[PDB]
Design a protein around this nucleic acid. Sequence first.
DNA 1: ACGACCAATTGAGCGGCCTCGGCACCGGGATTCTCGATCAGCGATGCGGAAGAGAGTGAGGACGAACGCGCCCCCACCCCCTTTTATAGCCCCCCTTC
Length: 154
Amino acid sequence: GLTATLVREDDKIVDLNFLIGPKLYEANWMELQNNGYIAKVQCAEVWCPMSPEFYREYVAIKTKKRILLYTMNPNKFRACQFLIKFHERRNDKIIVFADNVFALKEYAIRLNKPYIYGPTSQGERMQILQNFKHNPKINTIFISKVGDTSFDLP
DNA sequence: ACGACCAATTGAGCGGCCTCGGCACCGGGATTCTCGATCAGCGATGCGGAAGAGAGTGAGGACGAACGCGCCCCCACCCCCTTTTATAGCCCCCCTTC
């Protein structure tokens, strides 16, 4: 068995020890960065402050609807737009990731950038990746879970 | 001189049974509302079953081809033009007679 992320939220990961066997190896990612085999990634967490009228509803609504409201707010939106503009003018390739399609669409449309999600046909899907990779005028793509679940993204 | 004691008086306060049942506390009662599982959700995968896009070929189109006939040309070559004379009948135009 091979995998990049030998972790799952269920208590079934331990079954791999009898379904396949013990961990034959597990790379030290920091060592690989020190050796240059892996890119040095300066991870960060942007604490976007929620907007007051959003928090008012967010705190009021306790149902699953709050996932959308915490996902869509001016500050998070402005922060992404700012980081994108900055890195785009910095000539950096940027990949945007999201789960909820509603937020993904409303963000990508307002940012006039091409998104990618499940029902997007393989031809349309790959055509966007080729443009992003090669066309200098495009430098970011908005991908749903399709990008992280299983894919070969540039 | 008065202060306590004694007596007769008495009835409010007290010690108690009575009883009880409103309320609260206490504990123990089938419970209106808890939690702990099932099923539902969002967005993804894949499989399995469904449609449309390209094909064929009926066929008739346009028209390239292949032939003969056709008109027409450029081409050898051949004959006629012109001259002379003998010779004659034959012929027409003209003159001439009636």
